[PDB]
Amino acid sequence: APQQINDIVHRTITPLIEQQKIPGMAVAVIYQGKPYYFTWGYADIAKKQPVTQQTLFELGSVSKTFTGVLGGDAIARGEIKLSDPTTKYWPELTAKQWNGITLLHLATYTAGGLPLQVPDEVKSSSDLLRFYQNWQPAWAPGTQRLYANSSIGLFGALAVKPSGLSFEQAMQTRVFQPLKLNHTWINVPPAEEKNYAWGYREGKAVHVSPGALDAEAYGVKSTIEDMARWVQSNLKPLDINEKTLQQGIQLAQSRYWQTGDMYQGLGWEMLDWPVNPDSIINGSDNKIALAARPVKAITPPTPAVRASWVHKTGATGGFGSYVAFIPEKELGIVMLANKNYPNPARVDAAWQILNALQ
C-alpha cells in the first residue's frame, strides 16, 4: 500500500490498541476507490488465532446500515413507502398510540420514544406484538429522536413483509449476494466458525446472544474485506447494477431529520463535510448519541449529499465497530475490533486517518 496510508494508519491504530487494550483489530482504508487492509492481534486469545482479512467480527449496530439499505431497496421496488402507516403491515397494532406512526418514524427513531432495547423477556412474535401494543409514547410522532433498536428493528421486520421473504433471506438475496458480500452473515455457518473472532468483555470471550429483532438491529457479522466492499458500494452507488439496490443505497443516505449538526438517514447518519472533528467525536459518545433530542423535519428529505461525512458506530457486548466515508473524496474507513471500546476514540482515530488522506 502507499507509504502515506501505511504510516497514518499504523501511527494512529497502534497507540489506540495499546491505550484501549483491544485484543484484535482489522482496518480497511478506501482511498481513491481502492481498499487497503491492516490487521493486528488476536481473534481468539486462548487459541492464539490471529486476526486476518477473513476474520468475522460482530458489526453490532453497523448492521442498521444494512437494514436501512434493505428497506430503501424495498421502497425502490415499490413494495413499501416510508409514508405508510405502521398498521398497514401490522394491522394488529390496534392501540391508539400507533395512529400516525409511519415507517419513516420507525426507521429514523422518531416514533415518540420507542425504547433503546427490546426487553429480554420479549421473544416470540406474540410477545413482540404485546410489547408494542403496551408501549406508551413520551412524545408525538416526528418531534423527538431517541436512538433505539426497537424502532429501526421493527422497521426492518415490516419492510420485508411484502417480499414474502424472511428478513435474513431478503438481506442475503437483495443486498449481500448482489454486492458480493460472500462472507457476511446474520447467522454464522458452521463452516465459517473457524474465522469467527471471539468478542472480549471484562476479559471473557463472548459472542452476541439471540434476541428479538437481533438480525434487524445488530446481528450482522462480517470480514474487513466485505466491509470495505460495503463502503465502496455506499461511496459509489451508481456503479451498482441492480437498479433498486442502487436507489436503496441512495435513499438510505437521504437527510430526513436534523438535530444539531447531524442528519438522520436510514441507518446511516450524516454531517456536512468538512465536519468539525470535535462535533463528530464528542457526538459519538453515548451521552449524546443515546440522548432524546428534538428534531427538525427536512421537508422534503435532501437526496444523498456527496459532500458528507457518512458514518455509523456499532457495538455488541464484546465488539466495537465504526465505518465512515466521504463520497465526494472516494475516501472511507472501516475499523473492526473485538472489544467494545469508547466511541469517541473510534471516531478520533478515523478522523486522524481520513483527515490526513483528504
Ligand SMILES: *[B]([O])([O])[C]([N]C(=O)[C]C1=[C][C]=[C]S1)C1=[C]C(C([O])=O)=[C][C]=[C]1
Ligand atoms: B448499537 O448502537 O451498537 C446497539 N447494539 C446492540 O444493541 C447490540 C448489543 C448486545 C449486547 C450489548 S450491545 C447498542 C449499543 C450500545 C452500546 O453503546 O454498547 C447500547 C445500546 C444499543
